[PDB]
Write a protein that binds this ligand. Structure first.
Ligand SMILES: *[C@@H]1O[C@H](CO)[C@@H](O[C@@H]2O[C@H](CO)[C@@H](O[C@@H]3O[C@H](CO[C@H]4O[C@H](CO)[C@@H](O)[C@H](O)[C@@H]4O)[C@@H](O)[C@H](O[C@H]4O[C@H](CO)[C@@H](O)[C@H](O)[C@@H]4O)[C@@H]3O)[C@H](O)[C@H]2NC(C)=O)[C@H](O)[C@H]1NC(C)=O
Ligand SMILES: *[C@@H]1O[C@H](CO)[C@@H](O[C@@H]2O[C@H](CO)[C@@H](O[C@@H]3O[C@H](CO[C@H]4O[C@H](CO)[C@@H](O)[C@H](O)[C@@H]4O)[C@@H](O)[C@H](O[C@H]4O[C@H](CO)[C@@H](O)[C@H](O)[C@@H]4O)[C@@H]3O)[C@H](O)[C@H]2NC(C)=O)[C@H](O)[C@H]1NC(C)=O
Ligand SMILES: *[C@@H]1O[C@H](CO)[C@@H](O[C@@H]2O[C@H](CO)[C@@H](O[C@@H]3O[C@H](CO[C@H]4O[C@H](CO)[C@@H](O)[C@H](O)[C@@H]4O)[C@@H](O)[C@H](O[C@H]4O[C@H](CO)[C@@H](O)[C@H](O)[C@@H]4O)[C@@H]3O)[C@H](O)[C@H]2NC(C)=O)[C@H](O)[C@H]1NC(C)=O
Ligand SMILES: CC(=O)N[C@@H]1[C@@H](O)[C@H](O[C@@H]2O[C@H](CO)[C@H](O)[C@H](O[C@]3(C(=O)O)C[C@H](O)[C@@H](NC(C)=O)[C@H]([C@H](O)[C@H](O)CO)O3)[C@H]2O)[C@@H](CO)O[C@H]1O
Ligand SMILES: CC(=O)N[C@@H]1[C@@H](O)[C@H](O[C@@H]2O[C@H](CO)[C@H](O)[C@H](O[C@]3(C(=O)O)C[C@H](O)[C@@H](NC(C)=O)[C@H]([C@H](O)[C@H](O)CO)O3)[C@H]2O)[C@@H](CO)O[C@H]1O
Ligand SMILES: CC(=O)N[C@@H]1[C@@H](O)[C@H](O[C@@H]2O[C@H](CO)[C@H](O)[C@H](O[C@]3(C(=O)O)C[C@H](O)[C@@H](NC(C)=O)[C@H]([C@H](O)[C@H](O)CO)O3)[C@H]2O)[C@@H](CO)O[C@H]1O
Ligand SMILES: *[C@@H]1O[C@H](CO)[C@@H](O[C@@H]2O[C@H](CO)[C@@H](O)[C@H](O)[C@H]2NC(C)=O)[C@H](O)[C@H]1NC(C)=O
Ligand SMILES: *[C@@H]1O[C@H](CO)[C@@H](O[C@@H]2O[C@H](CO)[C@@H](O)[C@H](O)[C@H]2NC(C)=O)[C@H](O)[C@H]1NC(C)=O
Ligand SMILES: *[C@@H]1O[C@H](CO)[C@@H](O[C@@H]2O[C@H](CO)[C@@H](O)[C@H](O)[C@H]2NC(C)=O)[C@H](O)[C@H]1NC(C)=O
Ligand code: NAG
Ligand code: NAG
Ligand code: NAG
Ligand code: NAG
Ligand code: NAG
Ligand code: NAG
Ligand code: NAG
Ligand code: NAG
Ligand code: NAG
Ligand code: NAG
Ligand code: NAG
Ligand code: NAG
Lengths: 317, 173, 317, 173, 173, 317
């Protein structure tokens, strides 16, 4: 009689469909998902240092809007700005807002050193009813609103050398008065000019008197500018009026820091990859949750699923 | 597909083989049996784990990047930002699609190859004592009990022992 | 005797050469072209809405140069600017011309709503011999040149709220006079200032008196600026002279719209993909006609031909 | 190429086969014939149509983009615009070149594979009644008229019917 | 790997074969010999030179580009410049990694294929005069001196000359 | 007895490890390196035309700082700026320094044609102790510092047509005085204004009087601007003071030219591909020496080695 010997391979009742070079649908015994498509909905507070901005933008914390006093000198790997955030101080704008936000976010610190500028012949610490701190008229904590002393505002010519190892970042401003009275009361004269210079830079700014639509009852505006001063170099502030002066400088670092707009809650959990929708696992090489990512993350792709076969072709009985 | 065994000369897989990917079924005097081959099974599995090692848990750290949504109409610089991100995403989306298509075609082919190698290896081992029926089964032309079958599976089968018996049976009239 | 049975495959007298991984020239039985390399030379008017600019740039149609009166309130999927186009109104420039063009092109509409601005105490509808409409001195249809009333130009302080669902786009300007006379005749005084503000923005612009090389006999210039006003927000125009005021706003939409420079004629035909050289078929995945494309188009590559084999290797008798 | 049949042990293709891609030529007592095999031909064709379905008519809608020609010297931002477009175009140009090279290598290989599978399938079917001459032809050692040949092509050939005749002829002196 | 010869049924390579990539070892009455096969060796080499022609000396001219290092903190436009360059570099780094992985897998496979084709070609040539021992060696069942071996290597071996001798030896008891 | 015939393949004692799709380490008989990872450390002076800037930036050679007099009218395929470079003339800045550098570098020539501008009623050739040429007070060779004639500086209104085939590039400036005396001595009056215009362009610039930190004992600054004039078009310079005028124009070309920061020495050797670290061979398709490259170069990748197998799998005895 003899014998029969059959060579063969396994199969499964429940196959999965994958794509190939020659066929968009072929059934294999097993496959695994290469596109991550879900989050828990939380931003994990580990292992990256997360700073929840809450009611504050990065810029409001920078300037020192009173509701952001808690942020002073904080660091972050990732700063999270909330859409409910709002300003509650003197109305202001920033030419190149986006660049200032970006370079501060990237630096990853709000570390501030105070400096003693020689402001002889003016009155310091000007305040407003638009910027309430601890139930009292106040101003931005990092800024110094200079007004007249005995109805005179003489020409300012103040200097500050950078003898440090690092770049200093100086934040400063110009008061654009709403009316004639908003120029006369603080500076008791017609016009200001501000020239902030270094060995390698100069910015000059004219106040423009004129009514703007009221924001927190105020038709004036502050315009915010910035200046970086290298080691060896010197800051020079030249002003005949309308200067919103710095009280010192911010350290500017390089590192891995950034900022992300997100309304997702912060959770007590550990995940390497953050998106605005929440953290995501990073086992898979691709993800379709968000093009915006921070950390060790899968790369963003348009596809919502990509199956990699991990078994032979399924050919059931 | 490209070797012709799986979904080719082997008519279908075996659902009742749950301890390996490839193996042996036999009929002899002592009954009808099934045993998985571990080496062919592990060879396919090691290659697939090979691909997985290159794809799973291999991600890239990125930190500060550009902005990718906007609340303001700004024109030229915003067009460039959007265009760069859109360009990037299409190129990676393309890489991901191609990657999976090629890997899947290769996985199907290498699994078919292992089947074929097992079959060929067994054929050579049997020498003149058996014939290929064309459906992945051999007709063995000698008495072949469970020890004898076991010996073909373990690679210890000595064809000389049975050759006389087998040629007599094969070249009968 | 028995028999002979030979297994084999076909071949053809006329093979084609393709590239492979191991060989830059191998002959196969058949192949197909993957790079589209030709157009008919026409831009098909379907299925995309094509607006032929003819003698007008997008910006000239926007401002309302008299030869572009036919474009009022038109929409487009694709705006085609011709190289023969030329301006025929008051000479002007646009700081960030490219961005204004781009954001209007992308919005895809010239829909304009008139608004009644309170211009009490000035003369409206100033015209010039440089901008002829229907054989009469005229001006840009969307702009309102304000001059003196009874040799006085008082300070303007005009407001306009955005209570709509959409962003409003306001287009406005500053007259830079060529000489002293070009400032005295229209405004009968020395200098202007314009401050266009919102709750979130402020632009301020000084006229600079000075001769420019004559264009259509005119040494003065108009400089054009723009302002977007969000829902809830308010436009404020503050002027002491030289204001080229808006007559209302443009709707700004989002969608698939764009603009393309091209001298190709528009044809009565249906093609999904447009290039400046004309429309192209989109069966193939790649094309080498133009890097500039609009619609469902093959991707641009540097290669002029790529043959995909659609048959076995050719091995003739 | 990689299987060794087309442009390998098969010396050349047949220009006079115009109704299929693969087939059979025979000489017997009743003459010299040719017939195409439909299944192997369709298997190759389906795979090639597979590749075409992924490549033909699959284009991507793009609308407002960046500017890509310029009449003015502008410096930094224009350098970036040009560089982004030049970067993009080289990456796609690379994708297109690689794609066609791999697909073409695969098409050549899978067409060679179908030839090989047909050959092997026919060899198994003949059992001990024929020998492989090494040039893709079998010497069949029994009388094999047009019905018999037809039966080998349709997969209905019963080797047992002719086996006695064939062994007598093969193992003659 | 995918054909099963190199690192498969052939147990190892031969360090003492320095004049070719593939060849023949024999034992006969006149001693134990080795000769390289030039055609299989050249076929593998031509394909590998094929890949090299596409990769070596094929570089792309680039001239004025964007800046890629910076001494100043500038924000938005510098972020975009850096991001574009970082994007580009990852895409090319990916292309280079994938390219080498696929080419290397293909080179390993095509070299294994040439081994297999040589083996199969030799098997067909021997017809019924030899048996496959399963380790890439044939037992030849007739007297086969150096001229006879030489004739198998040059493709001039006539199996009919020895067939009677061989069948007598093979189907002995 | 018969015979034994064994088929086989070669092997080597010393294999190399390569990566594959299924295995990160497999030994092959032979491989070749696809990533170029080394330079000799020299920039080869052939076959590209290399201009070593030595102590001069491109901009200093452009303006005509006295230590850069040797660069006049030179061309280059690649301009190499050294980190030791420094300025030694009147202190200055350039708004959009990077763009001017880039467009000049890309043009690839410093070819300068002198023009005779009608400067009647002012004194030409103003010099300074900050800009020493041949032991005498001098200035930038391409610039013309205009001062008062007989304590009067009348309004300038000078014109210059472009009748050439090419774009002209005009380089010019504004003197920002440090103090009142630095404005009175040269222009003997209060304020300047400069308006440089064409048919299609206008730039206007106000001097701002104010002290800057001293650089080479000078608290004033020059600010440098530029203007391109097309064929058919006309330059117009309008000035009431503080103009640093052009002495003519630069040709602006298109071609393959560029600029690279590097401290590598120039060698007598021939290499197609230049990096800042030195030239590199270009046999390989990839390189990890520098992301900055000029010429026919391998593409930059993050990997330091990629081995391509050029032999079968190695399976030794
Ligand atoms: C279909 O195909 C897939 C892929 O081959 C198979 O899925 C794999 O299955 C294995 C074993 O069942 C899984 O291995 C386990 O991984 C655990 C870690 O899992 C997390 O992290 C990985 C990232 O590395 C993620 O992919 C995953 O989603 C999880 O978040 C280990 O902790 C496990 O180890 C266990 O056993 C060992 C003993 O050897 C102990 O040391 C451990 O303590 C622990 O008890 C285990 O190794 C693997 O995660 C799966 N991979 C993927 C990519 O999904 C399927 O099994 C297969 N299906 C069938 C039916 O065969
Ligand atoms: C070499 O290889 C190529 C690719 O395999 C073959 O070319 C294909 O050939 C087929 C049949 O001859 C063509 O099929 C026809 O397509 C028509 C549509 O063509 C247009 O649109 C496509 C995009 O989808 C473009 O690629 C193309 O350029 C055209 O602009 C159909 O309308 C045809 O249908 C006809 O028959 C059916 C009956 O089944 C009817 O329903 C229809 O009414 C109509 O009469 C037909 O299907 C195909 O277009 C070609 N493809 C490509 C990519 O070129 C060559 O045939 C082959 N050469 C040889 C010698 O074999
Ligand atoms: C392992 O694998 C590699 C790749 O297959 C082999 O390396 C190749 O080996 C050959 C021959 O030994 C080399 O060929 C020689 O190239 C010279 C030019 O070399 C320069 O330029 C190339 C770029 O094209 C660079 O790759 C290289 O680094 C050099 O800078 C030719 O001038 C040589 O020609 C000589 O012989 C001919 C006669 O036919 C004469 O005409 C000439 O005058 C001259 O005497 C020669 O062709 C080749 O460069 C190597 N390629 C690579 C990519 O490295 C190894 O040989 C192999 N190892 C083993 C052990 O086999
Ligand atoms: C109905 C109406 O609004 N009438 C206005 C009237 O408000 C306006 O007076 C100003 O009103 C605002 C409230 O909107 C403040 O009360 C202004 O006072 C302060 C301020 O808090 O902002 C006081 C503060 O001490 C001042 N600080 C300094 C450093 O000077 C500031 C500052 O001068 C200005 O904010 C600068 O813009 O002002 C108060 O002046 C009057 C004024 O003309 O006009 C009516 O029509
Ligand atoms: C030979 C020569 O050019 N001599 C000039 C002489 O042209 C110039 O007078 C002006 O000439 C232009 C033509 O180039 C126009 O005719 C000017 O009139 C208008 C205009 O059409 O532009 C009339 C119009 O009603 C005015 N509109 C308003 C709202 O005021 C405008 C407007 O005032 C100006 O265009 C503003 O720039 O002017 C005409 O003024 C004289 C003037 O100094 O100088 C000779 O040298
Ligand atoms: C201790 C101290 O610095 N005291 C200053 C004193 O330096 C300064 O006088 C000026 O000093 C500088 C040196 O730093 C030069 O010597 C200035 O002279 C020149 C110049 O070389 O720069 C002379 C030159 O001929 C002038 N050229 C023209 C075309 O006018 C220029 C030019 O006017 C100015 O550079 C413009 O900024 O000046 C010299 O003026 C005095 C002046 O107020 O102040 C002391 O406090
Ligand atoms: C210019 O116009 C605005 C808008 O009417 C005036 O601002 C309003 O002033 C009243 C009373 O002072 C406030 O209650 C409103 O809240 C203001 N509205 C806005 C939108 O700002 C402004 O006073 C005018 N300016 C001058 C100098 O007359
Ligand atoms: C400044 O110079 C320009 C150029 O010479 C003067 O403009 C010319 O004026 C004449 C007569 O008024 C016109 O016919 C020309 O067409 C003008 N040419 C150009 C190029 O504009 C201009 O008048 C001068 N300005 C002053 C205020 O004197
Ligand atoms: C404004 O302040 C600066 C800094 O003190 C003054 O510049 C210094 O002046 C002295 C003497 O004239 C020089 O020796 C120093 O080198 C200067 N230092 C710097 C950093 O510039 C400047 O004179 C002041 N300006 C005015 C107009 O009083
Ligand atoms: C944030 O603002 C909301 C709404 O005004 C308020 O209820 C909440 O207490 C604020 N939180 C902080 C931390 O200031
Ligand atoms: C700068 O300060 C100095 C000295 O107080 C003064 O002479 C000059 O006018 C000031 N200039 C400006 C623009 O503030
Ligand atoms: C993540 O958030 C974005 C917000 O733009 C949303 O469009 C997207 O669908 C969300 N994705 C997931 C997977 O939740
Ligand atoms: C073959 O292997 C199995 C162990 O895996 C053993 O049980 C069986 O008895 C072996 N038989 C022979 C004949 O070697
Ligand atoms: C466009 O301009 C040309 C040349 O001036 C003219 O002939 C043609 O009629 C104009 N067409 C329109 C629609 O204005
Ligand atoms: C704005 O208008 C107001 C009121 O008419 C006036 O007081 C002020 O001077 C104007 N300012 C400007 C810059 O036009
Ligand atoms: C399309 O137009 C462009 C204009 O820049 C030209 O360079 C290109 O060669 C044209 N291509 C074809 C295929 O007509
Ligand atoms: C084989 O198939 C063809 C039909 O395709 C038929 O004409 C022929 O007679 C068949 N022969 C046998 C023996 O089945
Ligand atoms: C086979 O080829 C070699 C030459 O390559 C020759 O020396 C040998 O004698 C040949 N033998 C026969 C039998 O053809
Ligand atoms: C460059 O500057 C250095 C240091 O001041 C000097 O020694 C050298 O001679 C200068 N070379 C030239 C060409 O000016
Ligand atoms: C331009 O020059 C003219 C004529 O000399 C003069 O009337 C005018 O005031 C000057 N303007 C400026 C800004 O220099
Ligand atoms: C080349 O120079 C750069 C300077 O940024 C340095 O980081 C890099 O390591 C150098 N590379 C080599 C291979 O010398």
């Amino acid at each position: 009689p003899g014998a029969t010997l059959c060579l063969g391979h396994h199969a499964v009742p429940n196959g999965t469909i994958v794509k190939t070079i020659t066929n968009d649908q072929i059934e294999v015994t097993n496959a695994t998902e290469l596109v991550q498509s879900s989050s828990t909905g939380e931003i994990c507070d580990s292992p990256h240092q997360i700073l929840d901005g809450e009611n504050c933008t990065l810029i409001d914390a920078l300037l020192g809007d009173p509701q952001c006093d808690g942020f002073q000198n904080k660091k972050w790997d990732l700063f999270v700005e909330r859409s409910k955030a709002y300003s509650n101080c003197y109305p202001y704008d920033v030419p190149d807002y986006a660049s200032l936000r970006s370079l501060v976010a990237s630096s990853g610190t709000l570390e501030f050193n105070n400096e003693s500028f020689n402001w002889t012949g003016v009155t310091q610490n000007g305040t407003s009813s638009a910027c309430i701190r601890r139930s009292n008229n106040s101003f931005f904590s990092r800024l110094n609103w200079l007004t007249h002393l005995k109805f005179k505002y003489p020409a300012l010519n103040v200097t500050m050398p950078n003898n440090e190892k690092f770049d200093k970042l100086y934040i400063w401003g110009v008061h654009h008065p709403g009316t004639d009275n908003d120029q006369i009361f603080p500076y008791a004269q017609a016009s200001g000019r501000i020239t902030v210079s270094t060995k390698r830079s100069q910015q000059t700014v004219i106040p423009n008197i004129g009514s703007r639509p009221r924001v927190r009852n105020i038709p004036s505006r502050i315009s915010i500018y910035w200046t970086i001063v290298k080691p060896g170099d010197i800051l020079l502030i030249n002003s005949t009026g309308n200067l919103i002066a710095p009280r010192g400088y911010f350290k500017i670092r390089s590192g891995k820091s950034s900022i992300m707009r997100s309304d997702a809650p912060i959770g007590k959990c550990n995940s390497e990859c953050i998106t605005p929708n929440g953290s995501i696992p990073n086992d898979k090489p691709f993800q379709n949750v968000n093009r915006i990512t921070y950390g060790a993350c899968p790369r963003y792709v348009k596809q919502n699923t990509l199956k990699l076969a991990t078994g032979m072709r399924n050919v059931p009985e | 597909g490209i070797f012709g065994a799986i979904a080719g000369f082997i008519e279908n897989g075996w659902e009742g083989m749950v301890d390996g990917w490839y193996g042996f079924r036999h009929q002899n005097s002592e009954g009808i049996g099934q045993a998985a081959d571990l080496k062919s099974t592990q060879a396919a599995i090691d290659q697939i784990n090979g691909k997985l090692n290159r794809l799973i848990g291999k991600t890239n750290e990125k930190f500060h990047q550009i902005e990718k949504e906007f609340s303001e109409v700004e024109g030229r610089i915003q067009d460039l930002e959007k265009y760069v991100e859109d360009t990037k995403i299409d190129l990676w989306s393309y890489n991901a699609e191609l990657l999976v298509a090629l890997e899947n075609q290769h996985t199907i082919d290498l699994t078919d190859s292992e089947m074929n190698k097992l079959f060929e290896k067994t054929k050579k081992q049997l020498r003149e004592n058996a014939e290929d029926m064309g459906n992945g089964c051999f007709k063995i032309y000698h008495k072949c009990d469970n020890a004898c079958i076991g010996s073909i599976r373990n690679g210890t089968y000595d064809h000389d022992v049975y050759r006389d018996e087998a040629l007599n049976n094969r070249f009968q009239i």
